[PDB]
Amino acid sequence: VSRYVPDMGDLIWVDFDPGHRPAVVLSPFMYNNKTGMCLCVPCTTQSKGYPFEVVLSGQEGVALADQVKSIAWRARGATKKGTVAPEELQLIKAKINVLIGL
Amino acid sequence: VSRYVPDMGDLIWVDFHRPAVVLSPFMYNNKTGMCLCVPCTTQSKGYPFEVVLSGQERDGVALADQVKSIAWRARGATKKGTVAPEELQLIKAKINVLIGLS
């Protein structure tokens, strides 16, 4: 068996001590594969209307864009839940861009 | 007393005892009691996401792919110094690559 490697835009399920969480992958395949790590933002089903939330529209959740985190995806057993729509990735990025710059 | 509030570019100390470069704006850090940070280390191992922090005596390295949201107000945070504007830009520029933020 060959392992699933996170890619840009992937929605993933990741595990921590002690709980499992969805996250959106911001870094590209090359990086994620080489380092066994990735940049991502955490998701929840609870939308409270914070300025940095981005709606993730599924059948019938919110990504917290200010909550960027480097995670070792390989070691945490990341699995693929789905993929965000290009407009949703563009948006998460657009907000991260705010907290920071370019 | 008025607590120290991290501003973009500041070099802080946070316990868990680690230095970090604060990438997010002051309005944000102050409102949310959190900030986006990159961790700093003593020895540069040669990785491409390293950014040297040039001290008047000795130097240090900011690990730019290791962005993390940290609760400063909660973990406690103190100011060591401020990074050079070009040090701040390069760190962001490298993040901009790992992401593609527009």
Partner: peptide, 15 residues
């Protein structure tokens, strides 16, 4: 904001 936690640092995560 509510700070999300991943628990104990894993692998190459330095923190």
């Amino acid at each position: 904001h509510e700070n999300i936690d991943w628990g104990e640092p894993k692998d190459k995560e330095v923190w």
